[PDB]
Amino acid sequence: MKEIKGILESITGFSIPLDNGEYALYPAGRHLRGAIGYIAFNLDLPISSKFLDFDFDDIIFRDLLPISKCGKIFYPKNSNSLKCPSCNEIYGSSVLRNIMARGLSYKEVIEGKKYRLSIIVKDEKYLNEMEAIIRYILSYGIYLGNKVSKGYGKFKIKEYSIVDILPVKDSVLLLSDAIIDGEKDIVFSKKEISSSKFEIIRKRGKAKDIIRNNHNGFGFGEII
Amino acid sequence: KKVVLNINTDNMCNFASYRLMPFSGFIVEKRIEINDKNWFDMIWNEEYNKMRSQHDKIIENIEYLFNIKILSKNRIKEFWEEFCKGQKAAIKYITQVHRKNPNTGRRNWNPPETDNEIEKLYETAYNTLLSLIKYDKNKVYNILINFNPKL
Amino acid sequence: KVVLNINTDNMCNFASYRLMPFSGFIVEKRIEINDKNWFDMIWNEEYNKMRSQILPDMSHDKIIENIEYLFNIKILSKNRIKEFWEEFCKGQKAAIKYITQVHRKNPNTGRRNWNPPEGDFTDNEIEKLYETAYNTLLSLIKYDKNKVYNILINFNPKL
Amino acid sequence: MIKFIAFLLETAKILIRNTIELTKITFYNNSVSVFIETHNGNYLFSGDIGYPPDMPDNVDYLILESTQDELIDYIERLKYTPYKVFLVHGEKEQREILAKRIISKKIRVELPKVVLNINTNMCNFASYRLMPFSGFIVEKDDRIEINDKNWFDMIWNEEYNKMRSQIVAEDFSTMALPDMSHDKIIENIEYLFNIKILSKNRIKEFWEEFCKGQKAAIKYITQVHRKNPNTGRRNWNPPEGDFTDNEIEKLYETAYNTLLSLIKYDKNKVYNILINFNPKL
Amino acid sequence: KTMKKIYVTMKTLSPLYTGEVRREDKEAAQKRVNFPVRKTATNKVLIPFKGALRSALEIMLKAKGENVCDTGERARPCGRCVTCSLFGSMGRAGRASVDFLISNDTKEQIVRESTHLRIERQTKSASDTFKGEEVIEGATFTATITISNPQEKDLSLIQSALKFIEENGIGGWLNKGYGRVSFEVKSEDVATD
Amino acid sequence: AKTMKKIYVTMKTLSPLYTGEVRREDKEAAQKRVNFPVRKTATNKVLIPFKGALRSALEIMLKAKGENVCDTGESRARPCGRCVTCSLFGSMGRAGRASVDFLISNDTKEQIVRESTHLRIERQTKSASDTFKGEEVIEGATFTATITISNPQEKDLSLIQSALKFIEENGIGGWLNKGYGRVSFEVKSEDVATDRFL
Ligand SMILES: [Zn+2]
């Protein structure tokens, strides 16, 4: 049970359009999965062959919450923002920046900031599978958010560290959105290359918050 | 007493048994660092900024001025932006764009699509939107929705 | 390591940061930082190698006072100060030759190529003002480029 | 123009007794050689030699090869002897040994961005003519030129002037100026703004030199107000009006005193003063 | 699988303009510059680089006679052309993903505020002026073209569209001389890391 | 659609040539050593705005013939999108067919840009009241610009050459009343199939 800890810098800005008009303040781990899925698809790996399944544990992509100036990690309930325990920074809406292109109205979060990579492999076969794509993305670049082909959302890894997992026991604070059948609306997709099938898979669950026993886990539902 | 260099040491010539490069410097004292002009343009900007830290009649008139392009979609959007900002920004905005420059004589309104008629239509724009600056914001929204679809 | 080979006089103060406008040559030698003098000496050393194979001292305040006085009588105009800046910038032997050229009393005419003084002065003293001008402008050549520029932009800004 | 690699020829861009007409191309037998004609040239790629071959009818260029007597026999018996022969496809010393004999028959050889000399002396040392020179290679966007230390001296002096006249001593950094109330500052700068002594460029330049400290503003206002000894001219714009000569001087003095009195006011205060006059900054 | 990587270096030979798209940054620069250049928050200049490629290949391959749809106009990619297979269609994902053209340089070195006019033709005098910002010449920009499942007709089409960008220009104000550039290209095939 | 007209224009100055420096930082850096710097590239080559010269030349000459050509000269005016200058140089709803490159010189500043000394003389005293320095591009300096016309008609060549004789008569750049900017044009025209890069 190892990890892939990483500081990723946005070279180009990124955009993820949640419902009713809201945009993601940070890139989610579902996008870090999806992009690595395309990457493995073109790298001919068994990770690629498995990425169709959502319940695929082993390799789990926690969301990419941002790093503060104090070398630590921002934490989010009822607070559409991010705060850190050093209490130095509030990362929020101000980072959105509305872009009016030709006929296109959308918003993105600006670049120049740093985000976490944390892929908790449990079996070492998929650790080697993950090492190869980490040594790929270090070479070229990963594309998170919409408009990947236009160039939006390039992240360069500055630090590829193969760290080790010490599990957690609590009954804890959700870093992302659990899927318990609570009240948070969580929407995502299952775009299927070599089937020409796209489906928007919608779910409900818990917001990003207070949470209590087994907790055999914890990339929508993450907690620490 | 220490020295640190902050300019690229890669695109440099070789001549006369010394690997030399002509370069422009900005020797800073703190160590003694040698910076280029990009750092000096930076510091010059950032010290600058630092110092730089410190009712049917209006419908008929707006329907007239939409066709001869005096008031325009950008003008509707920014006048409605001043109204949505409040009332002081509205008076400041229409005072600013009605402000005929005493040097050149050209107003900031868009031209109609004589000079007496030009002044009369620009005054019509002033009394029209300055009358509109006092009404309720819902009425301003419904009148401005008809001509600019977005705002 | 890196060695600067420049005396750090003429350092201004931009906000809270001390600052020097400067031009030089990165030398990958001790990664030395060398001035233009270096380049002139090494150019002439390679010229001699290639072809082979086939000043009085005056105080600074006295220099300001004398250049002040000679500026007021218009012996040292800004045309003279500008051309002296050109001939000093070109080098020192050029500045020596230029100052000897303007100070050389021509044996056939008896005329110095300076500008005459404004005002009534005896011919002996007018000559002594000329010799004073020779002494200061020659003594100016012993200094570096930076103090020469800083001295003569108070009298000809643009020089 | 032949570019050596085989043999490329740039006129049609062909690369090496009936006549095929593409650039008149015609293959004579070597006992095979090709004679190409173009408006700028009559080139001959001979190939190798074996004894009575078939030389073309004027062969302006003759690109031959050898590794010795037969090469020269073929160098003769060709009407209108070539301008330049080319010695290819052989060992270098044997090519030079043949080439000495093509020079003895007075025929020129060449053994296998535009660059401009902006130089100026000569020496006759050894077999070749020369001039020793240390210089500079500039690589402009369509030329590559050669210069000496006089040109480097001129651009070095231009860089020194451009970099000295770019940073003042205590600008943007951290007394005895005049003092006058805000109301008289209003009346004076209104009056000196209608007539053009205090104009929007001058208010803007006061704003930049005030943001760069009080002393930069004092230096700017003094050098604007400094009357020349010779011309007697100050760097103000002339007032538009009758003002004969003495209230001209009192009016420039009013501009001097009003700006110098405005200097010790607060930065936000002089900002609220100036934007009524110059809306920009 | 093979993945084409096309490193695209662009030396500008003419002033360059691309309008800022960020609305709050546009009103932030509007009191100073009427036409702000599209910048980063890293303070770097990026240029849109896919629709120039797609438009170049569209007009060129159109007049060659290859069946392409014009994605200028109600524009709808088909899914059939060389253009829809290369750069993308509605359903089928684009084989080519082309980066923004970020400069190797920052903004205080390469983009400068400038002056543009509108001159009356009878009085021969500047009737209007405005501060549009513009990118200096010789400023080198960089992108990577990520092509997946390549054909043999992929190198030539990308360099042909790059030469069409070299003659038409990139960015905005394309008819008053803005954006005339040159391209240096370096290609590689990557299959296994 | 299938063809483009290419107009290689080589222009050689028969007079001193002044166009103004446009960039604020370049101007303010050279508002000290010279007071009217000319337009430079950062590759140190002289820029001349060419499209407005041709567009102005065509609009004056076509209003002289009485054709229903508009005028984008007055403040904040409107391209009607229906004239021949509106078809050639563009409107607000449609772009211009004739993409007009900047007049790029083949030399740099030390070869063609010279500083100067321009004066203002008092009429009664006959003395120099004012002095100011201003850069100019020399006579005999030559420049290139490529005008590329997509969707060509028959008359784009004739209108572009006619505009170039009008530019020769009036001048190009600034200080046109003092004799600056009088030039001569040479044109090499070529028809092009648009797919020649394939
Ligand atoms: Zn299609």
Ligand SMILES: [Zn+2]
């Ligand atoms: Zn029109």
